């Protein structure tokens, strides 16, 4: 019955892309909740990444699929946006 | 993929959601999961399971009216399902009808499903009633790339009979 | 018995239903409604979501003659809220 410190959200970024990314920012939106996309150069047109209320870059210089897997590039996103 | 699994008796049905429960109430599962399992002749075997959402989970969301996604969210917030969240208890749980979902994509079986690439020139989707869509990335302009997966919608349809 | 429907007692009773019709009607200029191309159409879905498209698509000349009824959007959910 033990739920984390920090556990309440104003703020929500979804580590992925394309449909599934855009069913969460749904949910969060309905949920009063501001969302935040990462896109990869090459996606760089995704719907998803215009869906979110704030989206950044990631993986810059590497291959598309490896940039969608750099974990602390998302982080650091997560954290600087808040 | 499609729900409920319909070729199947209810009371069949309803053994196998046990036992994927029994295994989560062990092991303390929380947020979203599924388990599966391989039936044959009725009997089951858990294969796996999946520690996170699917692709497929719209159409769990048509037949039962709840919205997984937003749950997901809701639990990892702390909260309760059925005191905050608001489900009922388990065998009050709707079961509406069912559903359907297929992938579209570009992927072209006369060319062994390799996956099209190129500019989308018209992209007009359909709606109605029992009609679901959850799109990928396809809008008229748009430009398919190699990089990633092929799928431009999921199109998902639910009605009280199957047929 | 042949089309299916239930007895009046046993018709379901699902959440709740919001329909709003979207127009070119505008609400600065006294609701008039607008004429000309559409550019760009772009329609939401996802659950809970369903949509009734009258005239809208890109390209698509709104002509005076007509109404102004460019898609019916209804949402669904068990809760009103």
């Known amino acids: 019955g033990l739920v984390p410190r920090g556990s309440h959200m ?17 949910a969060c939106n309905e949920l009063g909740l501001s969302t935040v996309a ?10 998803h990444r215009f869906k979110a209320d704030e989206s950044y ?8 699929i490896d940039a969608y897997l750099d974990i602390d590039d998302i982080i650091r996103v997560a954290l600087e946006s808040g | 993929e499609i729900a409920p699994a319909v070729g199947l008796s209810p009371d069949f049905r309803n053994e196998i959601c046990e036992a994927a429960v029994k295994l989560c109430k062990n ?9 599966e399992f391989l039936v044959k002749d009725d009997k089951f075997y858990f294969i796996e399971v999946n520690p996170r959402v699917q692709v497929e989970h719209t159409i769990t969301e048509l037949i039962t009216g709840v919205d997984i996604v937003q749950a997901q969210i809701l639990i990892a917030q702390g909260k309760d399902l059925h005191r905050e969240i608001g489900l009922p208890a388990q065998s009050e ?36 009633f029992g009609i679901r869509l959850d799109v990928g990335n396809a809008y008229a302009g748009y430009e398919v790339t190699p990089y990633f997966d092929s799928l431009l919608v999921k199109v998902c349809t639910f009605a009280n009979e199957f047929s």
């Open chain 1, 38 to 47: 990462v896109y990869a150069r090459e996606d760089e047109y995704s719907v």
């Open chain 2, 93 to 128: 749980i709707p079961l509406l009808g069912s559903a359907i979902q297929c992938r579209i994509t570009t992927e072209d079986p006369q060319n062994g499903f390799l996956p099209d690439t190129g500019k989308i020139d018209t992209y007009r989707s359909p709606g109605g």
């Open chain 1, 57 to 64: 870059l990631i993986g810059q210089g590497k291959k598309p």
């Open chain 2, 27 to 35: 092991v303390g599962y929380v947020n979203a999961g599924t388990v």
């Open chain 1, 10 to 26: 104003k703020k929500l970024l979804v580590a992925n892309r394309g449909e599934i990314a855009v069913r969460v920012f749904r």
